[PDB]
């Protein structure tokens, strides 16, 4: 089991779908299309800002 956690600005939360390009993903971390697993995402404006 591998949990990979980070924080991204809320404009492209739905871009992290596998096999998709995007400036926050194609130059930081990309995901293979044959990936199996789950995605969890939520807003954290008040804990960080």
């Amino acid at each position: 089991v591998y949990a990979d956690s980070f924080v991204i600005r809320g404009d492209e939360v739905r871009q992290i779908a596998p096999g998709q390009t995007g400036n926050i993903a194609d130059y930081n971390y990309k995901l293979p299309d044959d990936f199996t697993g789950c995605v969890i995402a939520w807003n954290s404006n008040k804990l960080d800002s």
């Binding site: 096999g19 390009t21 995007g22 400036n23």
Partner: protein, 49 residues
């Protein structure tokens, strides 16, 4: 000013270069609802109009 539902405005675009790379961030395109053509590979097809 935009148009009404019964009087929507219709514009044909021709004789230019389909470049949606700058259309990614600017005009952020909140909907990924493209089903006839996959929007990730939009730049690889040529449209007569």
């Amino acid at each position: 000013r935009f148009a009404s539902v019964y009087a929507w405005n219709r514009k044909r675009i021709s004789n230019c270069v389909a470049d949606y790379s700058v259309l990614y961030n600017l005009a952020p395109f909140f909907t990924f609802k493209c089903y006839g053509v996959s929007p990730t590979k939009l730049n690889d097809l040529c449209f007569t109009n």
